[PDB]
Amino acid sequence: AQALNTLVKQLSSNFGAISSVLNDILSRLDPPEAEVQIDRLITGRLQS
Amino acid sequence: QCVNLTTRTQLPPAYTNSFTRGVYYPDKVFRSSVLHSTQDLFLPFFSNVTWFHAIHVTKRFDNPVLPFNDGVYFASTEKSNIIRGWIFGTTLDSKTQSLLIVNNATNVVIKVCEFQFCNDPFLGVYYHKNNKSWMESEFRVYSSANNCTFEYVSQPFLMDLEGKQGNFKNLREFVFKNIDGYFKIYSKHTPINLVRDLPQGFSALEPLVDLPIGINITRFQTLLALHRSYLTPGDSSSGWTAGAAAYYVGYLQPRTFLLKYNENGTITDAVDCALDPLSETKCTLKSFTVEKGIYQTSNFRVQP
């Protein structure tokens, strides 16, 4: 249970991006710029 | 317009301990049946607040200009309901803008202007005999007003003048906060009776209003209602005309609180992280029923 919790809770973190939700990223920023923020989110989520 | 009243003798200060009292919902987001830990401005869980016996009755009055620092918790309880508003500001004069909130039996008004507030402000009412009814025309709170940039009106949210006496003490609680150009006010209202005039029970403050007003505030003072009486020349008396009143004031601090949102989406239990080592355990474990054992709550280093 602990592991699962701490996995799902890691979705709340943004790992240095401007937001923790991909929907906010893709609604606020254009693809060429949102690419780097999504890169940060991808790296953080993959590591977790 | 201007009116002044002073007392040579000054009522002494008084400190009183404060229990769980003073917990408010930290965010506008909703939650339910979950334990959530968040850092925000709360008054320490067991905190020595300043209790003011503002009006006593052979009678004396208190008009203090209390300090303000990153939020304030206010509490009161009385049948007369003398308290009828607040004033906030860096200087409380025309030199800079200042905030005023006033309440009546039918509406609540809020304004931001360079008010020239008096040193002993109050709102006066008297029983007009011609109209055979109470009248309110003595706004002795301020001397002048200018540059009325921001104004707002709302309902009499908690001006309920219940006609009950005895074991029906009514408690009104408020929290004022200033964050990034927002003056945000939470409040709660509940009848409870205890030996002391502030119960140890646990309840949460709901968000009352939010004003998007940018201002620097470090001072504030209460507003009290004075019921004038027809003092004829034979009496040859004049001065304060109001019943006894008192309240409690406390200063918020940046703390981490763990709150227990119930099934109905209500918080009825919370713990302060820094209050006690046991509360540190409860916070780090994100629970209230800590099992027997030894826990690495946190870490400490001798500071330089």
Partner: protein
């Protein structure tokens, strides 16, 4: 199967023109600020007209801004020499900033 959109039915327009062509502009040391809220803004008009030399958006893309909602908008106004325009940007060091 379907996509829905829900916004409050605020049938009012509050363009920023009253601030943009304000005849008098405050000094930089006394930069003017205006708060706008509770209204619908058509941001397209802002960037659809060839009337602005620099239009730089930080943390949000101008194209998508017509499909976003916000709590409040603070419009700041001042005047500076063109060479120092770049100083108005986060993370910039200079006397003006």
């Amino acid at each position: 199967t379907e996509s829905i959109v829900r916004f409050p039915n605020i049938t009012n327009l509050c363009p920023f023109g009253e601030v943009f062509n304000a005849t008098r502009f405050a000094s930089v040391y006394a930069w003017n600020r205006k708060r706008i809220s509770n209204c619908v803004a058509d941001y397209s008009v802002l960037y659809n007209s060839a009337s602005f030399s620099t239009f730089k958006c930080y943390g949000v893309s101008p194209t998508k801004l017509n499909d976003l909602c916000f709590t409040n908008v603070y419009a700041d106004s001042f005047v500076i020499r063109g060479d120092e325009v770049r100083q108005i940007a986060p993370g910039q060091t200079g006397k003006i900033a």
